Amino acid sequence: NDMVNWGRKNSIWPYNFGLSCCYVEMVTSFTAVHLRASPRQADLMVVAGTCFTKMAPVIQRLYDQMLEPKWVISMGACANSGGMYDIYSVVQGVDKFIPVDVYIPGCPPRPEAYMQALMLLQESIGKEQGVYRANMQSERERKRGERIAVTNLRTPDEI
Amino acid sequence: PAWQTRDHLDDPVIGELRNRFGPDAFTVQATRTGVPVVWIKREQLLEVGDFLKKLPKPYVMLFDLHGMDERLRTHREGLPAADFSVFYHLISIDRNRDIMLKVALAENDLHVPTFTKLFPNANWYERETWDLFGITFDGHPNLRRIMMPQTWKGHPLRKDYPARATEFSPFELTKAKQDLEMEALTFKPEEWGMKRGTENEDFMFLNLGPNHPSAHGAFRIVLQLDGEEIVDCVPDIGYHHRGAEKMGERQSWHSYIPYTDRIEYLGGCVNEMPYVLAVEKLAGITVPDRVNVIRVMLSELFRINSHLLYISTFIQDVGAMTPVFFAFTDRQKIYDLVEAITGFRMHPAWFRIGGVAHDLPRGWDRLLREFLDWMPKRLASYEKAALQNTILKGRSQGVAAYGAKEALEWGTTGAGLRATGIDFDVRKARPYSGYENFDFEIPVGGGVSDCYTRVMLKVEELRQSLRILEQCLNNMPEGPFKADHPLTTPPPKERTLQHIETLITHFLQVSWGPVMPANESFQMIEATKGINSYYLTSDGSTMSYRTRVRTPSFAHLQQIPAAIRGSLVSDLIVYLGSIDFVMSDVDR
Amino acid sequence: HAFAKRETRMYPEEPVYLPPRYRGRIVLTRDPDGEERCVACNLCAVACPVGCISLQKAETKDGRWYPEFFRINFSRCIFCGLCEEACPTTAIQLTPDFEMGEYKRQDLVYEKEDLLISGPGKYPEYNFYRMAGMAIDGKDKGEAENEAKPIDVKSLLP
Amino acid sequence: MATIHVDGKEYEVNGADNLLEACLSLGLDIPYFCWHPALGSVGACRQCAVKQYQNAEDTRGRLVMSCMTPASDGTFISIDDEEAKQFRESVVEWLMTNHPHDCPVCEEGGNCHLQDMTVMTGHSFRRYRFTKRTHRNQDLGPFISHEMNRCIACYRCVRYYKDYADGTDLGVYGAHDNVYFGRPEDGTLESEFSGNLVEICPTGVFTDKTHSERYNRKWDMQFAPSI
Ligand code: SF4
Ligand code: SF4
Ligand code: SF4
Ligand code: SF4
Ligand code: SF4
Ligand code: FES
């Protein structure tokens, strides 16, 4: 029937863990798309910002608290990897210690990128981690012939 | 010129100290900091400072206290033999002057008496010097590690310490299990500060770490409670340490510019201004007038955006948030203009040494004119909505107030210090970036600094900034966007694409880096929050030898325990919201 | 109903407005003659503060420098645009396109076939080899801009 | 042995040495092309110009070449004299009038002495608008590639190859601005010490052909001391 799968695609509960920077665009997105988000109630955790060695146990306790079906979206270069901060005090990505499902490059990403993250995450949630032998197709490979066919762009002396 | 190497030996303070102590001991360094740098052996530091503290026009505010390694400097002509050094930047407001004091230390005897007794705000500064270096300050009350965890071995700002995470072992979670065991066994040994009260039913220990919104970053403030009173509040900072200062040592002068944008997420080009000004002070570059006006335009736009965010969040937490959410749409318009000029909404990384990255696109004036004519009616709607409101005004009077003396001892600058009667802006006292060719006023709060006064002053400053932005629209002159100088990095790109010598200059400047001769520069600006400065030392190479970033939020967050002692947890949260502190700035 | 009327519910718009200078997706462009513009000068790799570019120079029998491989790690890229302004051929450019998202980090590393587009991008007319002294097909010595013909040492004229 | 006065300061130098190796021994940066420590001074490039005064009270002296002037006791020189700086920048500009637009596609890029001296003098603005002289190249073996457009006529190659190494098959041809450095006819350079030309030539005329198969810039190299 796959009614159970339909249930999870239609509705998701977001836990916003945006840090010092990179969360103002996430707020810009959240106040347009949407006090409901609550700890130990959500199944989606959008890790944003730079993951630091000192506060990483906090993210690991919040990861442990959520229920069995766990989704994680890494947004920004500072959360996908160490980003620009390849330094003693920053861990090189949140994927070192928690599994991650979707990666959204940028610094900071755009609200439309958050929208496309929900679209790729309902697409993964609708194929059952969601590999299902369908996720080998990649956004690098899916729109490749779209991107290569671009020839002309507006000159940058204009608005 | 304003970049030439001066000794400042003629300055009156140098002659008063020479009269008082006669000859010897003092070696007046030659630098481009603009201030007099004096070396003073460590056995007389407390005496010397005391003399300056009580001088007939005293140096009331300790701007900065930090250390330098100095071990690897090959060009050391005139300095005494030092293996380490500690610098103290002091400011006299009544003299509008500064003085820098340098104490030399040897590698075997890194010991100096603590300076906290004269200036209390130095306490955390000395703690940072203990954390990042290995100088032990004898007589310090609580000399513990303030940035790294308590089991972190090594002093990260020493040059024998490898900077990058790659040189250490990757996150194999060998230490994650030990941090998990430590966090699970969360108990208080009473070593977290004075902690005079014992851990019993009489005093309750509460982490009180706000992870909610408007917290301006996730931090912990361990609090001792008795009768719902703040017996002792101890912040646990350092979670958002990004190692920007250490990062400055392994990046060229040009490729570091992106790192400046992230000391403060909301600042953008305000954070870039002091860095480019200091690097051009090392290079000896005078920029054209158009560069000055362009930089003023971008800095006042970012200042307007930051002030509008501070006002909106203040009205949201302690008041009615229904109308002020329209400012979110207005902030988008300020952003569409920034990405019209620079390219990207946040972290522009658009300022360069000697100029800017590109010229203004031809439709900038019409967009800025439409925003400047449209905005004042909305600004007056916020002025009526905030000046005339009664509920938060009644709530926001006398809530953790302080005076001029209290702000001075705690290094507090900005809207906090302007809320008292001290008329001190740096844009008028020490004009930079062509502010001396503009007409604007400094609002002032009188003698009481509280939450209503700070927001009213921020609204008045936002109106003066809008007057500056209209003067930028109506008096933008014509000519180049980049200085003509061999150290302007990069060269104009159309010249690079056709001319061989410009191509060679661009080739070596973007690859090896520009070679700045060995000297020391220092610039401070009025930031969106307080006074932000950059103290850069070059050893003659293409990378910085020492980068010190003074952020005011560190001092503003250090000030809370003096004022909030004798208040409720609600007054604490309201004060934390009112004070202009961001975790990224406190931890750089 | 009047309060709901003035606060109309927001409707998302499928078209998105970006300025020309927007710093999104990194592309490699082509000459107006149709050849790849990148000469593997390795300035973009060194000028990047985070080090997200790896490339190797190749050389045709014709003598045209071109990259054997070009690799950008977009997981670490911050879109600072220092690479675009470092490039002395305008080969690498930033386009208004932020549409990126992937299930695996290994698929965020872009090769030359994911970056090389079919046209010239922001600057339709600039060709670097017309300026350069180096000789390629269609361009013998003295066929560059502001370059005179080669005079041999054996010429009779003194 | 000798005491010299440079820009007011005083230094101790060897009297037998010339002023360029004396000032370079003290860490004073003077640009140069044609001088080499092994090869000696000939005075061709005119790049090492300094202002020399007769004594401490002479305010207006003459521009001399530090490679061609002995560092005798009592010498008064100024490296940073404004007229000397203008002359050295002008010499760099005159060498820049005919240089090809090749740095992105030059194997010497990032390792080029001419780039370093151009930045050191501070010449970044082109005034010359006329045509550039060009030359055809030669084949010099499987080891050394040749791009004569990049030559600055410093004469280091002929002074190394004939005088020092006693090679016979490299010379200078032509006259005025048409000087050509190479072989009389294409063919492998016969000398067993031909490859030092890649270090001796300050530009990218003679470059390593074995390195140009798999080229990378110097900043991307990893080095160790080996035997
Ligand atoms: S991704 Fe960009 S905005 Fe987000 S934390 Fe990193 S640098 Fe800041
Ligand atoms: S700078 Fe531009 S042309 Fe040179 S290697 Fe990089 S991308 Fe290619
Ligand atoms: S945009 Fe910035 S981070 Fe990305 S490749 Fe270019 S220089 Fe590196
Ligand atoms: S040889 Fe030197 S000066 Fe000539 S193009 Fe190459 S790097 Fe530039
Ligand atoms: S070929 Fe090289 S060594 Fe010979 S004159 Fe020209 S630049 Fe000097
Ligand atoms: S290097 Fe001294 S004159 Fe040529």
UniProtKB/Swiss-Prot annotation, chain A:
Keyword set, alphabetical order: 4Fe-4S, Cell inner membrane, Cell membrane, Iron, Iron-sulfur, Membrane, Metal-binding, NAD, Quinone, Translocase, Transport, Ubiquinone
Note on how the cofactor is bound: Binds 1 [4Fe-4S] cluster.
Catalytic activity: a quinone + NADH + 5 H(+)(in) = a quinol + NAD(+) + 4 H(+)(out)
Example GO BP: aerobic respiration
Assembly and oligomerization: NDH-1 is composed of 13 different subunits. Subunits NuoB, CD, E, F, and G constitute the peripheral sector of the complex.
Protein's recorded name: NADH-quinone oxidoreductase subunit B
Recorded topology in the membrane: Peripheral membrane protein
UniProtKB/Swiss-Prot annotation, chain B:
Species of the source: Escherichia coli (strain K12)
Catalytic activity: a quinone + NADH + 5 H(+)(in) = a quinol + NAD(+) + 4 H(+)(out)
One GO term of the biological process aspect: respiratory electron transport chain
Region (NADH dehydrogenase I subunit C): 1-178
Gene Ontology cellular-component annotations: cytoplasm; membrane; NADH dehydrogenase complex; plasma membrane; respiratory chain complex I
Intracellular or extracellular location(s): Cytoplasm; Cell inner membrane
Location of the region described as NADH dehydrogenase I subunit D in the Swiss-Prot/TrEMBL record: 202-588
One Pfam match: Complex1_49kDa
Function: NDH-1 shuttles electrons from NADH, via FMN and iron-sulfur (Fe-S) centers, to quinones in the respiratory chain. The immediate electron acceptor for the enzyme in this species is believed to be ubiquinone. Couples the redox reaction to proton translocation (for every two electrons transferred, four hydrogen ions are translocated across the cytoplasmic membrane), and thus conserves the redox energy in a proton gradient.
Entry protein name: NADH-quinone oxidoreductase subunit C/D
NCBIfam families attached to this UniProt entry: NuoC_fam (TIGR01961), NuoD (TIGR01962), PRK06075.1 (NF004739), PRK11742.1 (NF008728)
PANTHER family tied to this protein: NADH-QUINONE OXIDOREDUCTASE SUBUNIT C_D, NADH-UBIQUINONE OXIDOREDUCTASE 49 KDA SUBUNIT
InterPro entries referenced in this protein's UniProt entry, alphabetically: NADH_DH_suC (IPR010218), NADH_DH_suCD (IPR023062), NADH_Q_OxRdtase_suD (IPR001135), NADH_quin_OxRdtase_su_C/D-like (IPR037232), NADH_UbQ_OxRdtase_30kDa_su (IPR001268), NADH_UbQ_OxRdtase_49kDa_CS (IPR014029), NADH_UbQ_OxRdtase_CS (IPR020396), NDH1_su_D/H (IPR022885)
SUPFAM superfamilies for this protein: HydB/Nqo4-like (SSF56762), Nqo5-like (SSF143243)
Curated annotation (Swiss-Prot), chain C:
Ranges where the 4Fe-4S ferredoxin-type domain occurs: 28-58, 68-97
Gene Ontology MF, one: quinone binding
Annotated EC: 7.1.1.-
Record-given protein name: NADH-quinone oxidoreductase subunit I
Subunit architecture: NDH-1 is composed of 13 different subunits. Subunits NuoA, H, J, K, L, M, N constitute the membrane sector of the complex.
GO cellular component: membrane; NADH dehydrogenase complex; plasma membrane; respiratory chain complex I
Bilayer disposition of the protein: Peripheral membrane protein
GO BP: aerobic respiration; respiratory electron transport chain
Function: NDH-1 shuttles electrons from NADH, via FMN and iron-sulfur (Fe-S) centers, to quinones in the respiratory chain. The immediate electron acceptor for the enzyme in this species is believed to be ubiquinone. Couples the redox reaction to proton translocation (for every two electrons transferred, four hydrogen ions are translocated across the cytoplasmic membrane), and thus conserves the redox energy in a proton gradient.
Swiss-Prot record, chain D:
Subcellular location, principal: cytoplasm
Presence of keyword Phosphoprotein: no
Domain 4Fe-4S His(Cys)3-ligated-type: 83-122
Annotated [2Fe-2S] cluster binding sites: C34, C45, C48, C67
Gene Ontology MF terms in the entry: 2 iron, 2 sulfur cluster binding; 4 iron, 4 sulfur cluster binding; metal ion binding; molybdopterin cofactor binding; NADH dehydrogenase (ubiquinone) activity; quinone binding
Residues where [4Fe-4S] cluster 1 binds: H99, C103, C106, C112
Subcellular location: Cytoplasm; Cell inner membrane
Top-level taxon of origin: Bacteria
GO cellular component: cytoplasm; membrane; NADH dehydrogenase complex; plasma membrane; respiratory chain complex I
Residue numbers binding [4Fe-4S] cluster 2: C151, C154, C157, C201
Keywords: 2Fe-2S, 4Fe-4S, Cell inner membrane, Cell membrane, Cytoplasm, Iron, Iron-sulfur, Membrane, Metal-binding, NAD, Quinone, Translocase, Ubiquinone
GO biological process, one term: aerobic respiration
Domain 2Fe-2S ferredoxin-type: 2-83
Subunit structure: Composed of 13 different subunits. Subunits NuoCD, E, F, and G constitute the peripheral sector of the complex.
Family according to the record: Belongs to the complex I 75 kDa subunit family.
Known role: NDH-1 shuttles electrons from NADH, via FMN and iron-sulfur (Fe-S) centers, to quinones in the respiratory chain. The immediate electron acceptor for the enzyme in this species is believed to be ubiquinone. Couples the redox reaction to proton translocation (for every two electrons transferred, four hydrogen ions are translocated across the cytoplasmic membrane), and thus conserves the redox energy in a proton gradient.
Protein name: NADH-quinone oxidoreductase subunit G
